[PDB]
């Protein structure tokens, strides 16, 4: 079944849009193809949380155990990184990992690159062009930019509060060592959130492009190692994003 592309040719990679597309027409702010998926992922997270913590059984079992294990692992990792600031940042770093992970896995779901609304696929026969539905929020720059700037504001606030006025201007008055490194540190901190957002943006985007291209080459048994690589790298990207945020906080305070 290696040459199955002859019977089923996927066609050219129509999915090459480098921006969010409005799914439902709205007079005000439209709902983008990534915003609906973000809402769906939030709904799924709420559903699993309310399923796990509805009873609050003493001995964890089943779904409660599964939810507890990952949270405990994240708590232990963050305690390993820093001691006293885990509780101050645990919800934000925890939700920045779980929320983007399911969206990352949502990209691997069937129909992420094919199912869509009208404005050779299916809608090319009709006059209206074919746009994809179910686009991961991480594939959209707006969501990544928002979470990166939220994390940046958080670390700035918790560095200013931790070191008082010192974090306001580091040790610029040294003039021996912390004179040119200080501005270097400041510009590094300036480019840090852009790197954070772009890391999640490019990885998922390249994931969609690779998944579509592999279908174009051979849409049977060829994109399976790439599918495994992508489902692994989405979780790994979420984990490294959370760990990077907490480590940036830890180096900010100290």
């Amino acid at each position: 079944s290696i040459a199955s592309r002859f019977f089923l040719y996927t066609g050219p990679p129509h999915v090459e849009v480098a921006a969010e597309v409005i799914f439902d027409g709205i007079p005000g702010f439209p709902i983008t193809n990534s915003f609906v998926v973000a809402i769906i992922i939030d709904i799924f997270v709420i559903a699993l949380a309310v399923a796990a913590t509805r009873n609050l059984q003493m001995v964890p079992r089943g779904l409660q155990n599964v939810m507890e294990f990952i949270l405990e692992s994240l708590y232990n990792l963050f305690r390993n990184i820093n001691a006293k600031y885990v509780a101050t940042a645990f919800p934000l770093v925890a939700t920045i990992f779980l929320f983007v992970l399911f969206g990352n896995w949502f990209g691997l779901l069937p129909g992420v690159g094919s199912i869509g609304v009208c404005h050779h696929d299916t809608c090319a026969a009709q006059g209206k062009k074919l746009v994809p539905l179910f686009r991961a929020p991480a594939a959209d720059l707006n969501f990544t930019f928002a979470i990166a700037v939220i994390s940046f504001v958080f670390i700035e606030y918790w560095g200013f509060r931790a070191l008082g006025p010192g974090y306001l201007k580091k040790f610029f008055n040294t003039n021996g060592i912390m004179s040119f490194v200080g501005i270097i540190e400041f510009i590094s901190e300036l480019v840090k959130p852009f790197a954070l957002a772009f890391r999640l943006f490019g990885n998922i985007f390249a994931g969609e492009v690779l998944l579509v291209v592999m279908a174009f080459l051979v849409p049977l048994l060829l994109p399976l190692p790439f599918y495994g690589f992508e489902v692994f790298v989405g979780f790994i990207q979420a984990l490294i994003f959370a760990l990077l945020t907490y480590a940036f906080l830890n180096i900010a305070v100290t």
């Binding site: 990679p13 390249a206 492009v209």
Partner: protein
């Protein structure tokens, strides 16, 4: 002209050069760690796998950019 083809080829090749030495260093270090008291096998293979995951992520970045230019 065929300058687009040259762009695609240069993209894929120069996106593949980095990972070639990358995963090589990764696996060399991993096997060296294994050879010294092979008792931490699980951890070392997991860290090697996440490292090569990042490395092949850059490789896939180069590959997909080359493919998109091929369009």
């Amino acid at each position: 002209e065929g300058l687009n083809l040259v762009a695609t080829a240069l993209a894929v090749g120069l996106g593949a050069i980095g990972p070639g030495v990358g995963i090589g260093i990764i696996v060399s270090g991993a096997v060296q760690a294994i050879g010294r008291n092979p008792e931490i096998e699980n951890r070392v293979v997991t860290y090697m796998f996440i490292g090569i995951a990042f490395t092949e992520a850059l490789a896939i970045f180069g590959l997909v950019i080359a493919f998109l230019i091929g369009f």
